[PDB]
Design a binder for this molecule. Structure first.
Ligand SMILES: Cc1nn2cc1CN(C)CCOCCNC(=O)c1cn(C)c3ccc(cc13)Nc1nccc-2n1
Length: 266
């Protein structure tokens, strides 16, 4: 959990930045090998809560935390996913095949099926928060808004609203209620982003105009080259009523079966 700063070597140039601070590449000295790491460098309570969520998770499709370090700044040290965010990768590699996109979004659904089984809500599931280990291996990152659900409740109730509204289900916006089914809605938006090679969803629209569009029963169109089966799955994730929206066990199964059909056709 608490890492030794003497064993961490940070690179000078950052990989990326945000309002939180920076993400830098580093190296952590192990009992024998060196481990390449991604380090989120800073607020403190939020980073510690994010670290506490990551320490409880154990799944091949979720970013693994090595530990935290309290040195010049507070640091969250994670296993490195070298290829970076999925949205940026697809913007820069617009000839990635449709079968490969299905493979990656199916990996995300497996990580989310595990989070749902673990009763954690992600609350920020978007293509910018998926990282690539390789072109054929995605991991979910960014547990800063994540919550462990109480034993007696199926949702987390936020007290007041900095929210990624274009990824949020109607019950999040209207009742401040976040469940695994709310993450399924975000997963539908993530699928649209991935099949659109990292394009932003609801292009040119304000959050209130997105709410108005969804309330009229309107949904984003089918991205170019996206198979009908995958657009149908996106629309099922965007089921307005939480009760009738599928959970990640059903979503992952649909994706798994379609992925095997495409692997067979190829
Ligand atoms: C919370 C968290 N973890 N993290 C990143 C975040 C932060 N998220 C993504 C939200 C903010 O994104 C904007 C900042 N941009 C980048 O992080 C990255 C940019 N390039 C080119 C990368 C290459 C590898 C990589 C990360 C990045 N690798 C990695 N591997 C493991 C974890 C990690 N990044």
């Amino acid at each position: 959990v608490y890492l030794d700063r003497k064993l961490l070597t940070l690179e000078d140039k950052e990989l990326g930045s945000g309002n939180f601070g920076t993400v830098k590449k580093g190296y952590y000295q192990m009992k024998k090998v060196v481990k390449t790491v991604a380090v989120k460098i800073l607020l403190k309570d939020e980073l510690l809560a994010e670290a506490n969520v990551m320490q409880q998770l154990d799944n091949p499709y979720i970013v693994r935390m090595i530990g935290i370090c309290e040195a010049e700044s507070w640091m969250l040290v994670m296993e490195m996913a070298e290829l970076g965010p999925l949205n940026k990768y697809l913007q820069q590699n617009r000839h990635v095949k449709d079968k490969n996109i299905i493979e990656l979004v199916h990996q995300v659904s497996m990580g989310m099926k595990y989070l749902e089984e673990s009763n954690f809500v992600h609350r920020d599931l978007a293509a910018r928060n998926v990282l690539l280990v390789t072109q054929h291996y995605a991991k979910i990152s960014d547990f800063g808004l994540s919550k462990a659900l109480r034993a007696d409740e199926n949702y987390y109730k936020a007290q007041t609203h900095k929210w990624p509204v274009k990824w949020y289900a109607p019950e999040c916006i209207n009742y401040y209620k976040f469940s695994s089914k709310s993450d399924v809605w975000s997963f539908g938006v993530l699928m649209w982003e991935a099949f659109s090679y990292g394009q932003k969803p609801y292009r040119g629209m304000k959050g209130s105009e997105v709410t108005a569009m969804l309330e009229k029963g309107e949904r984003m169109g089918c991205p170019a080259g996206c198979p009908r089966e995958m657009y149908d799955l996106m629309n099922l994730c965007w089921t307005y009523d939480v009760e009738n929206r599928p959970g990640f066990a059903a979503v992952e199964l649909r994706l798994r079966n379609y992925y095997y059909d495409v692997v067979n056709h190829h």
